[PDB]
Amino acid sequence: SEYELPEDPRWELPRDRLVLGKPLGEGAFGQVVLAEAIGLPNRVTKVAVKMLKSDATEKDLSDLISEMEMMKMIGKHKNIINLLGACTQDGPLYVIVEYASKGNLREYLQARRQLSSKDLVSCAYQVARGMEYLASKKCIHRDLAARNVLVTEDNVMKIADFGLADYYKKTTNGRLPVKWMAPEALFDRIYTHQSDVWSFGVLLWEIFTLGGSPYPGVPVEELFKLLKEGHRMDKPSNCTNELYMMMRDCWHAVPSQRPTFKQLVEDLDRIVALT
Ligand SMILES: Nc1ncc2c(n1)-c1ccccc1[C@H](c1ccccc1)C2
C-alpha cells in the first residue's frame, strides 16, 4: 500500500468530483476537512474527508485503511457517521464520510444552556440506538463520550470514531478520557460492549448536565482512588431519579449486571414517550 492501494469500485470517487475545503479537525489521526462531493447524480453534497497529514508514516496509512475497511463491514445506520466514498487511487487516501454541521454533542449542549427535557432524553436514545447497532456489528467503541457524538444540521446524533484502529493525555478541551472508562477496562484492560455501557452512563451524565465536565479537577491518581472506593457521581439537578438509576445501573461494578444497549434502547424509548 506504500506504492498503491487495492481498488474497490463500489466506493471509489473520482478526484475531479471532490473539492476539499476548510479544516474540521486535526489530530495524530491525520486531519479532517469539509468538502463538496459531486454525485455520490450531478447532486452536490457537503461531506467530511479524513486523510493523512504530511508527516504520517506507513503504519498511519494502514490504520486509516483499516478504519475505512471497518466502516465498510459495519454498514449504514442513521445514528453513526457513515462511510460515503473514498479516493484510494493515484494520490493520497481520502475517506469520505457524512458531515455534522452542529459540532460534537458537548458543544451542542453547552451552546444551548434551547433543549426540552424530551430533547435530552431523545439525545440519549439516539446515542443508545447507534451503540446498539454498533454492538450488533461487533464494534466496541472504547471512548464513547459526548465529544465523540456529532450532531447534524437536522439534529441527528451520530457516533464518530467507532472504526478506529496513556492515562495522562488530555483531550482538546483539557479533560481526561479515563473519566469515561469502565473499571474493568481501566484496571484489568477488559473492553466489552458492557464497558462501553459504563461509558454511556458518563455520557448520560454529560447530557443531563448540559455538557458538564466529569470529576472536574481530579487527576488520574485520584480518579483511580475514587473508582476503587466505589464512588459514583452525584445525581445532576434536573434529572429524574429514573434517569439517575439508569446511570447508576450503567455504573454497576459488575459488567453483566449493567444493562445492555438493547435494554438501554427499550427503556429510553419508553422514557422518551412519557417525558
Ligand atoms: N463536523 C464534522 N462532521 C463530520 C465528521 C467530523 N466533523 C470529524 C471531525 C474530526 C474527526 C472525525 C470526524 C468524523 C469522522 C467519523 C468517523 C470517521 C472519520 C471521520 C466526521
What are the domain boundaries of the chain?
5-99, 100-273
Of 164, 201, 160, nearest in space to 181 by CA: 201
Per the annotation, the verdict on 143 as an active-site residue is: yes
Separation in Å, CA 204 to CA 124, 199, 268? 6, 9, 11
Of 81, 91, 78, nearest in space to 25 by CA: 81
What is the resolution in angstroms? 2.0
Q: 100-273 — its CATH code?
A: 1.10.510.10
Q: Which method was it determined by?
A: X-ray
Show the ligand 1 pocket: residues with CB < 6 angstroms. Answer: 24-25, 32, 48, 50, 81, 97, 99-100, 150, 160-161
* 20, 51, 97, best to mutate for ligand 1 pocket (most atoms within 8 Å of CB): 97
Of 238, 235, 255, 246, nearest in space to 124 by CA: 246
Q: Could you give the CA distance from residue 142 to residue 216 in angstroms, rounded to a whole number?
A: 21
Q: Strand 44-51 vs strand 31-38: parallel, antiparallel, or unpaired? A: antiparallel
Of 168, 155, 232, nearest in space to 201 by CA: 232
Q: In this structure, which amino acid lies at residue 169?
A: K
161 Cα to the center of ligand 1, angstroms: 7
Q: Which CATH architecture has domain 5-99?
A: 2-Layer Sandwich (3.30)
